[PDB]
Amino acid sequence: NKLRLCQVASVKDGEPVAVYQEKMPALAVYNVDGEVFVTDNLCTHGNAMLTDGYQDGTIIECPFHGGSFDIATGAAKAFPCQIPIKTYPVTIEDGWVCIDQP
Ligand code: FES
């Protein structure tokens, strides 16, 4: 069923949270205008973590190359990002950010 990632309270808009859950690839947790989204953290273009880049609303920019993704959709937006980031459907369970065990 569900995997707890981090407390909802820990995720501020503009400051994504790296979560390393033992079943999963590195994960990134975001708050966009008060709502939570979860993506893979490893950039699809290289060896950088998206939680070390720059959130601008629904856009997360990679710390390298100027690449970017849409947090909410997974879309690769700014070049050189081309392969969409994996996203996960999010549930809040008792104050925790959760995703399904996949
Ligand atoms: S490693 Fe993220 S855009 Fe190149």
Author numbering: 3 to 104
Quote the authors verbatim.
One of the terminal Rieske oxygenases, biphenyl 2,3-dioxygenase (BPDO-OB1), is responsible for B1's ability to dihydroxylate large aromatic compounds, such as chrysene and benzo[a]pyrene. Rieske oxygenase systems have multiple components whose function is to transfer electrons from NAD(P)H to active molecular oxygen and ultimately oxidize aromatic hydrocarbon substrates.
The asymmetric unit contains two copies of the BPDO-FB1 molecule. The final model contains residues 3 – 104 in chains A and B. The structure has been refined to a resolution of 1.9 Å with a final Rfactor of 19.3% and an Rfree of 24.0%. The structure of the biphenyl dioxygenase system's ferredoxin component, BPDO-FB1, is the fourth Rieske oxygenase ferredoxin structure to be determined and shares significant sequence and structural homology with these proteins. BPDO-FB1 has structural features similar to other ferredoxins including three stacked beta sheets and a solvent exposed Rieske cluster. In addition to the conserved CXH-CXXH motif present in all Rieske ferredoxins, there are two additional conserved residues, Phe-71 and Pro-82, in the dioxygenase ferredoxins. The conserved proline is located at a hairpin turn at the apex of the ferredoxin and has previously been classified as part of a polyproline loop in Rieske ferredoxins. Unlike the biphenyl ferredoxin from LB400, which has three consecutive prolines, this ferredoxin has only a single proline in the loop. Thus substitution of Cys-83 with alanine, valine, or serine, can probe the effect of local charge and hydrogen bonding on the reduction potential.
